[PDB]
Each structure stands twice: as C-alpha cells, then as structure tokens.
Amino acid sequence: GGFRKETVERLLRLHFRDGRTRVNGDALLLMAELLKVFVREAAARAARQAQAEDLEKVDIEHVEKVLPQLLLDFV
Amino acid sequence: GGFRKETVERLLRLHFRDGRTRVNGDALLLMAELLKVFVREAAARAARQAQAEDLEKVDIEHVEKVLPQLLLDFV
Amino acid sequence: QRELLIQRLRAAVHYTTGALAQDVAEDKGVLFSKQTVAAISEITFRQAENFARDLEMFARHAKRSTITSEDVKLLARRSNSLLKYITQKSDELASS
Amino acid sequence: RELLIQRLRAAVHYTTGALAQDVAEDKGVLFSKQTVAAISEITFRQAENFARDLEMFARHAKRSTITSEDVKLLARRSNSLLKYITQKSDEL
C-alpha cells in the first residue's frame, strides 16, 4: 500500500509558492515513501499514547498529544 | 549584551562535520542575534508558563513544559 | 473547478492515510475513530505542504527549479536511519 | 583543544544567565539556577542542529563557506525572525 505518484505530484504542486517549481520522477517516488513513513509514525505514536492511558480507542486528543514531537522529528 | 562573535564561531565549528568548513562574517553576526533571541524566547516562555501557575520562581519543569513549542517556532 | 480538484486530492490523501493507519491499528490492537483518522489525514495534508515548501526552497538554494532526489535526501538529513533507507531507495532508481 | 568544549559551555552558560535576567526583570520572575542551566544546555545543543544544517545547506549550494544565504534558509519558516536578526545585525 501507499500513495500514488500522481497524488504526491498534485499535493506538492498545490503547495509550491513558485509557478516554476517542478519535481522529477525519482523524487516523487521517494516523497511517496516519506509520506507513508510519516502516516505510519503518526498512527503508531497516537496508538502508543492511547495504550499508555489504558485505552482501546485512539481519540483526537491522543493525536494532539504526540503531534509536537512528531513534527520535530520530521524536521 | 549578547554572545561574542568568537563564542558563536567556535560553537558552530565545534559542531561541524568538517572543522575546515568556513563561515563568513555576515553569517556569524546573524547567528549571534539568532541565539540571543532563542535564549530570550526560551526564558520568556518558561516565565510566561510559571506565571500561568501563579509562581514567580521559574523551575526546570516550566522549561520542560514549553520546550516542544519553543523548538517548533524556531525550526 | 479549482475546488473540485482540491476536494478530490483531499479525498485521495484521506483514504490512503486511513488505509495505512488501519494496518497500524491492527498491529497495536487499538481502533482509530473516524475523527482520529480524519485528524491524521489533515495533519498529513498539511505536512505535505511543509515538505513541499522545504523541497522548493532547497532546490532554489541550489539554483534549480526542478526538485531532485538530492533535495529529498536533505529533508531526511537529521535521521540517519531514515536517510539511509531513502538514500538507497533513491539509488535503486538511478540504476535502472 | 583539551578544554575547548568546557570553555564553550561555560561561555554559553554565563551569557545565557545574563540574558535571562532582562526577561526576569521585565516579567517580575526569578529563574532558578537549574532553569538557567537547562536553557543554556538547550541552547548549546540547538546550536549543533543550526551548525550542521548551515554546513549542509552550503554544501547543497556547492560552497564550503557558509553565508547569509544559508542563514536565510535556516530561518525559512520564521520570516519575522530572519527580519529581526537582520535588523539587529545591521544595528552594527
């Protein structure tokens, strides 16, 4: 499973500041992998925080709690 | 008040992968001002948190509470 | 028509994010609510924006308008284990 | 070089403490000795992140000398910051 090349291309293109900017094909495949790693890390950290609170259901509070260090780790 | 240019140059060089990497004078002055702002922001955030708890004494737990957002606002 | 294209992109990100997150839910023995999945999709959408803006500025720093694998390696510069996987995921491509 | 690290840490520490007293006066607080030590250690450690990024950014531009361009990139997400440090730097 993972993000389609076209989804990543459209995502990046939507967010560029400069109309000149483009992404070559190899970088697109690498960014699809990096985005999948990001999602998996977000979900795994949120799940571990719920388990730390002895909970079966992961709530949006749990995502909010892990988000700061998640973002710092992907700088 | 602030960090001496010598301190900032040696501090950056200590942390380079290659100690022969050079840094010009303009960059050193910008980095001295950046580190001064970083210290003052860390101190102000920790103080501003201790005041939220109705305390005039700022303790290390207050630094710990504000650190993730401090780093997020600088990276 | 711009907003139709954006909504479709958001939907694509969401269902793929949700598919990936449920693999993790199973390995950990938890359930993600639909709002937790929606929150992770939205964070992922906004993190793609952070990634895109960095890649753009990294490429421009090297006087390029085209983003390459070298700019992606720079995104991963701080995690050797992540940089290591991306680096030799990258070198498979350049060999073909 | 036997004492370089110790000397840098001490110089960073006492300057950090001095700078924090301006904030203490402005907010009417007292920073504990351990709080100041914590802030100066965070600063020492964060300086490493800054330094390694600057070095890599210069190499990415095919330079072995870090310039203000590399600092601008370092501050790419803090335009208010970059603009203040540039203004304070020109106060020179």
Resolution (angstroms) stands at 2.0
Q: Verify that B39 and B17 share a domain, yes or no.
A: no
Judged by a CB distance cut-off of 8 A, whether residue A53 touches chain C is no
Amino acid at B16: F
> In the A/C pair of chains, how many CB contacts fall below 8 A?
163
Tokens 């023995």 correspond to C29
Q: Which chains touch C (3 or more CB pairs under 8 A)?
A: A, D
CB neighbour list of residue C76: distance below 8 Å, 6 or more residues apart: A34, C82, C83, C86, C87
Sign of the four-CA dihedral B57, B42, D41, B8? negative
CB neighbour list of residue D47: distance below 8 Å, 6 or more residues apart: B11, B12, B15, B35, D12
* Method underlying the structure: X-ray
Judged by a CB distance cut-off of 8 A, whether residue B44 touches chain A is no
Q: Which residues pair with D65 in a beta bridge?
A: B22
Tokens 């459209």 correspond to A10
D13 in Cβ contact with D40 (< 8 Å) = yes
Question: In which domain, by residue range, is C65 found?
Answer: 1-96
Measured from the Cβ of residue A19, the count of other Cβ atoms closer than 10 Å reads 8
Nearest residue in A to C22, CA atom? A43
C67 in Cβ contact with A27 (< 8 Å) = yes
Judged by a CB distance cut-off of 8 A, whether residue D6 touches chain B is no
Q: Verify that B44 and B75 share a domain, yes or no.
A: yes
CB neighbour list of residue A8: distance below 8 Å, 6 or more residues apart: A28, A31, A32, A35, C48
Question: In which domain, by residue range, is B42 found?
Answer: 33-75
Q: Verify that A53 and A63 share a domain, yes or no.
A: yes
Total number of domains constituting chain B:
2
Q: Verify that B24 and B59 share a domain, yes or no.
A: no
Q: Verify that A28 and A38 share a domain, yes or no.
A: no
Q: Verify that B43 and B73 share a domain, yes or no.
A: yes
Total number of domains constituting chain C:
1
| C54 Cα distance to chain centroid | 12
D70 in Cβ contact with B28 (< 8 Å) = no
Contacts of C61 in chain D (CB under 8 A): 57, 60-61, 69, 73
Query: Is A13 buried (19+), middle (13-18) or exposed (0-12) by CB count in 10 A?
Result: middle
- Rounded Cα gap, residues C39 and C21, in angstroms: 11
- Could you give phi then psi for residue D91, rounded to 5 degrees? -55, -30
Return the structure tokens found at C62.
């090297």
Q: Verify that A6 and A25 share a domain, yes or no.
A: yes
**Inter-chain CB proximity B31 and D71 less than 8 Å:** yes
